[PDB]
Nucleic acid binder design. Sequence first.
RNA 1: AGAGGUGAAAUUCUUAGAUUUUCUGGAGACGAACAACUGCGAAAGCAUUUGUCUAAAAUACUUCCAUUAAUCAAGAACGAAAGUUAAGGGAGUGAAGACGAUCAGAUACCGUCGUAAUCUUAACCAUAAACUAUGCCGACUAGGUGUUGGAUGAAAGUGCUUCCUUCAGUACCUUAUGAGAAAUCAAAGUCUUUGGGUUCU
RNA 2: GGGUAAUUGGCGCAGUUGGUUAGCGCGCGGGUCUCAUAAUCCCGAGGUCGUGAGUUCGAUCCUCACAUUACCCA
RNA 3: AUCCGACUGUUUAAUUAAAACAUAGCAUUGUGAAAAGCCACAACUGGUAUUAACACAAUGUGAUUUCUGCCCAGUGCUUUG
Lengths: 95, 133, 40, 210
Amino acid sequence: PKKRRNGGRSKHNRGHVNPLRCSNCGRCVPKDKAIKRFNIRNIVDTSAQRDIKEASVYSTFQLPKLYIKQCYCVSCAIHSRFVRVRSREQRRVRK
Amino acid sequence: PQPKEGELVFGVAHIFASFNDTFIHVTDLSGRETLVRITGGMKVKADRDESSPYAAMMAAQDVAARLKELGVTAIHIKLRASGGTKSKTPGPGAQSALRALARSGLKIGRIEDVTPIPTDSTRKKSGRRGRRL
Amino acid sequence: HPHGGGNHQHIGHPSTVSRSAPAGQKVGLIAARRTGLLRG
Amino acid sequence: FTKKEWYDLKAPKMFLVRNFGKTLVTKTIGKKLATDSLKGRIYEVNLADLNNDEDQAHKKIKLSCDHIINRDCYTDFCGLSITRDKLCSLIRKGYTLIEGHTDVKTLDNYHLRMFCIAFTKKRQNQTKSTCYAQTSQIKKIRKKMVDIMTAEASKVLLKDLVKKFIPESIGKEIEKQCKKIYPLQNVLIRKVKILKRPKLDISKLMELHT
RNA sequence: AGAGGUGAAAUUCUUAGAUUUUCUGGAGACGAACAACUGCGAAAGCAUUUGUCUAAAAUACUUCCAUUAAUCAAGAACGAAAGUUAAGGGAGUGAAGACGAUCAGAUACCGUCGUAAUCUUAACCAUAAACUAUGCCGACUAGGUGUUGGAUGAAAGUGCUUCCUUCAGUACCUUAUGAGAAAUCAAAGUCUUUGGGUUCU
RNA sequence: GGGUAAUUGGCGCAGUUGGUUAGCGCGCGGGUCUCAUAAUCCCGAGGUCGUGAGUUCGAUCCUCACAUUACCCA
RNA sequence: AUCCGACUGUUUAAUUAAAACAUAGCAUUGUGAAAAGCCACAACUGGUAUUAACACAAUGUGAUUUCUGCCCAGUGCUUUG
Ligand SMILES: [Mg+2]
Ligand SMILES: [Mg+2]
Ligand SMILES: [Mg+2]
Ligand SMILES: [Mg+2]
Ligand SMILES: [Mg+2]
Ligand SMILES: [Mg+2]
Ligand SMILES: [Mg+2]
Ligand SMILES: [Mg+2]
Ligand SMILES: [Mg+2]
Ligand SMILES: [Mg+2]
Ligand SMILES: [Mg+2]
Ligand SMILES: [Mg+2]
Ligand SMILES: [Mg+2]
Ligand SMILES: [Mg+2]
Ligand SMILES: [Mg+2]
Ligand SMILES: [Mg+2]
Ligand SMILES: [Mg+2]
Ligand SMILES: [Mg+2]
Ligand SMILES: [Mg+2]
């Protein structure tokens, strides 16, 4: 009965969209339907972070970050709880 | 060697963590002339736990002992995450290896991530519909 | 011929011979590294 | 097994430190000269430890040794890089990046590729979410980058070009002439690959080390 | 002196040096990040740089012609993937096939290999949830927030940016003495107050 | 007929380094904790192809088996 | 209507003219050269060769159409030191 107005993805005025592959399970998904996450992580936790600090030369050191940009399919994404199941009215709430 | 007073001697430690093992490989600062390689899987016997923090800690302790034996007193760090068409994040052993190296007694030079990302993408294993569990 | 004779027209012999065989004997597939359909 | 010797590495005097480490090698045996194993090696250094200033903590520098006096290697210039985390920190969603490359020859008959990179800016009084640029403007900007690289590199000389790399004059100049098309943010020379070298001439090389 | 791989392990590679780090040359596919409820095309589709050829809108116009138009049985051009013919190419992936595991059985889901195919050139085939499951042309009917490309008029600039109108494309929100069996719909409204034109089922 | 290698615990392998002459993984029986599986740490047992030395051993001719390559006048 | 061979072609002069041989098509193997592949000669020297991988040489099957499954333990051939 057409539970979603946009059909589960954001595509308009196009015929075809190229796919990408799930970062967890390898499945093919169109790029306009996969859920995207961008991560800015540290290399280590804070205790090891301070342990590196006084083992270091230069007296002023900052650890680098990591940049990842992962992408998931519906099944592999809501099994990990990046996305959950909502009610009929709450589904329409973007942002 | 024959270092001058209070002067540090440097080497490069290539770390590899791959969800199945942890390599700790120390060379000089040109890449050639390897010095130590303890790789984690020489510390346990269960055919698992090779990626556990415990094995990485033991390997780092062995590396620190040998490096002090040889005369090297400082280390540059390069981190790798096995990232070709395979996974992009490092495994559970990298943090333990870094912490053991830091608390060993050596001096830490610099840290960098060198995972081989492609702009290219040959096709990925486990064809469409993915790895089904 | 080395292949001649018989009541059914077969070779009866392995048809791949070696590089050192004498002149009257080197007659089938000479010093063949491999036989059969190629697949690459 | 360990019966080795240590050598000293020395950078050309374009930099400030000129002693950046040591390396091992096995003692010579019959017809293994222990000096063919040394020459041709490539060393990568950060340029923060070659000049002793932390603002230049990106921009790794590659050095190759060509001559060996009794216990020293002399290690002239090979290439550049930009330290991946720095590059990753520059790419945000709502902008556009321009990018181009070129081939060039110096007065010493070296050959190089240069690989610039750029991004758009705000011109703040706009109050709009995005700062995208049209394709034709991108084409014009890329042509300007290629022309400026060609002029600057083919003008002078190798070691002078290297001195030019350190304070990033090419980026400032490219940014300045591209203002009339579109404002641009931080502009960098991202990577320099050495492509052909004329011929070893140890007199010049040792003149680089006075 | 181990490496791979797994929920755990086998099959598999390795003191004839595997896996691992550095440099050099070759090969074939692919074009990340930027990249969007954004752009173009009749649909199928289209994403590294540069050159040439070739069309297509939209906007502006005190330019020319003057009904030259709408929709269309028969007929024609294009038409994903797979598949067929011939010559190339042949890295990665991998219908078939062979093993190793799990299980009461497992010709499967997991793992180690691996043929055709996937790519190019010249010909066929004419089918898809080929989907907005909504034919095409014209008129009327309601408020707001965006965005892509032109033009008009006005302010901060250090002949460029912001703002106001208007045309064309494209989304969303609210609401309907409007409609529906309802889900819902700006058309699926202007329908027992039933007839603007036309093809297919 | 000649040359080489190997035979050790319930299985598979180390010791052949004479004034110590016997060792380890799978095993085997008791605690450990294991939503009913799991890395688990202490232990007890388990023997040298056969006869003799200027000797304290795995050092000597030979004899039984096994594998490989090669040899041939009663 | 059935069997064999696709077809034109060839053969045991003097008992067998055929379903036997050849054939186009298909597939496999060796070789970059006068120090190579295959073959002749007692030696010295020759044939292919007035040639050069769209070539020369060694074998199987036998027009078109539709297909060509599993086995490398045995015997051959072949690769590394
Ligand atoms: Mg479609
Ligand atoms: Mg599941
Ligand atoms: Mg026959
Ligand atoms: Mg028989
Ligand atoms: Mg542009
Ligand atoms: Mg090739
Ligand atoms: Mg292949
Ligand atoms: Mg595979
Ligand atoms: Mg149909
Ligand atoms: Mg339909
Ligand atoms: Mg009615
Ligand atoms: Mg006939
Ligand atoms: Mg036939
Ligand atoms: Mg006839
Ligand atoms: Mg007759
Ligand atoms: Mg007759
Ligand atoms: Mg016949
Ligand atoms: Mg034939
Ligand atoms: Mg065989």
